[PDB]
Design a protein around this ligand. Structure first.
Ligand SMILES: Cc1cc2c(cc1C)N(C[C@H](O)[C@H](O)[C@H](O)COP(=O)(O)OP(=O)(O)OC[C@H]1O[C@@H](n3cnc4c(N)ncnc43)[C@H](O)[C@@H]1O)c1[nH]c(=O)[nH]c(=O)c1N2
Length: 309
């Protein structure tokens, strides 16, 4: 039941592509589709953007594309807008299984006055709205790809990968998990444990939930999946349910896996991290361990992978 992907020559490169296109001469890609990923109770829109790069801007899982939105740089007259980076949410083959498209998972940044709720177009996020407002056939200026922090370590096809996402931080993990489970990639046959933790505001804010739930039924011995819905759930202590609280529910299993060599990944808004560090410190203390010591070892061993923004 693994899906045929082409072209398999995408497996031949020994190093990830980097900076293939640069801001002064971007690649003009074409939008294939834009769809909302969220339901009516979600506090804001997050969109799935499919982009046809024609095979001209290949990438590895875990990398980012740059997008240059239209208009003048407000801080520099006559100059283009600055690049905004977006974690690629697709595998190298992309959602059409053909090596021609890549996908982004984009939260629409909308401004509301803190007192009156009143909006103001001039204070909306430029690139996120540009992307979420795009339609089939629209052109986008693409740069990159870039980034190496979130490349998937494939040396051990039976490794353990613990994936901690909030919101759009699910993006690299969608790509990892399709490569691990969905696509027929003969040179990478994953037989380890992939464990996805996802924190979002509510049920309607879930991203790609049907895809992840399907892996539980297809690969029950290789995939685990836990969700934290913060506005709809409460933690053991009674402060909104964050993803850290879900990690703590599996404290012993997770620490054992880390001690056994598991990779652990964090992606999403940088505000997710302080709570996670606090929980891990408390879990370590309860076990009689120093989290500082443990984290230093995880970093030295190249087990700790963070890309937050
Ligand atoms: C490695 C990496 C990977 C990613 C990302 C970053 C990095 C470093 N990001 C973030 C992304 O690059 C980008 O920063 C956001 O999409 C916001 O960009 P905009 O162009 O929409 O906002 P823009 O840069 O135009 O504005 C920034 C913020 O300022 C606000 N603002 C503007 N003017 C204001 C004013 N006068 N008063 C008050 N507020 C004002 C806007 O509302 C917005 O919230 C991301 N994002 C994402 O959604 N998905 C992803 O997968 C990723 N991945």
């Amino acid at each position: 039941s693994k899906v045929s992907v082409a072209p398999l020559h995408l497996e031949s490169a020994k190093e990830p592509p980097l900076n293939t296109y640069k801001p002064k001469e971007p690649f003009t890609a074409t939008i294939v589709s834009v769809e909302s990923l969220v339901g009516p109770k979600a506090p804001g829109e997050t969109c799935h953007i499919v982009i046809d790069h024609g095979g001209n801007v290949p990438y590895w899982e875990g990398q980012s594309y740059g997008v240059i939105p239209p208009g003048e740089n407000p801080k520099k007259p006559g100059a283009p807008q600055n690049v905004r980076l977006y974690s690629i949410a697709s595998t190298r083959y992309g959602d059409n299984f053909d090596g021609r498209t890549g996908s982004l998972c984009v939260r629409r940044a909308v401004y509301y006055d803190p007192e009156t709720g009143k909006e103001d177009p001039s204070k909306n996020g430029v690139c996120s709205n540009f992307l979420c407002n795009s339609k089939p056939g629209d052109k986008i200026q693409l740069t990159g790809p870039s980034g190496k922090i979130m490349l998937l370590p494939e040396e051990d096809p039976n490794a353990t990968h613990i994936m901690i996402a909030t919101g759009t931080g699910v993006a690299p993990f969608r790509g990892y998990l399709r490569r691990m489970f969905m696509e027929d990639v003969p040179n990478y046959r994953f037989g380890g444990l992939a464990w996805l933790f996802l924190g979002v505001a509510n049920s309607d804010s879930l991203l790609y939930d049907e895809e992840f739930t399907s892996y539980l039924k297809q690969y029950p011995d290789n995939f685990r999946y836990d969700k934290a819905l913060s506005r709809e759930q409460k933690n053991r202590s009674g402060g909104k349910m964050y993803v850290q609280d879900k990690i703590e529910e599996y404290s012993d299993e997770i620490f054992k896996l880390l001690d056994g060599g598991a990779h652990i990944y964090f992606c999403g808004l940088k505000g997710m991290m302080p709570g996670i560090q606090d929980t891990l410190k408390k879990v370590a203390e309860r076990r009689g361990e120093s989290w500082d010591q443990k984290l230093a070892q995880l970093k030295k061993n190249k087990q700790w992978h963070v890309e937050v923004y």
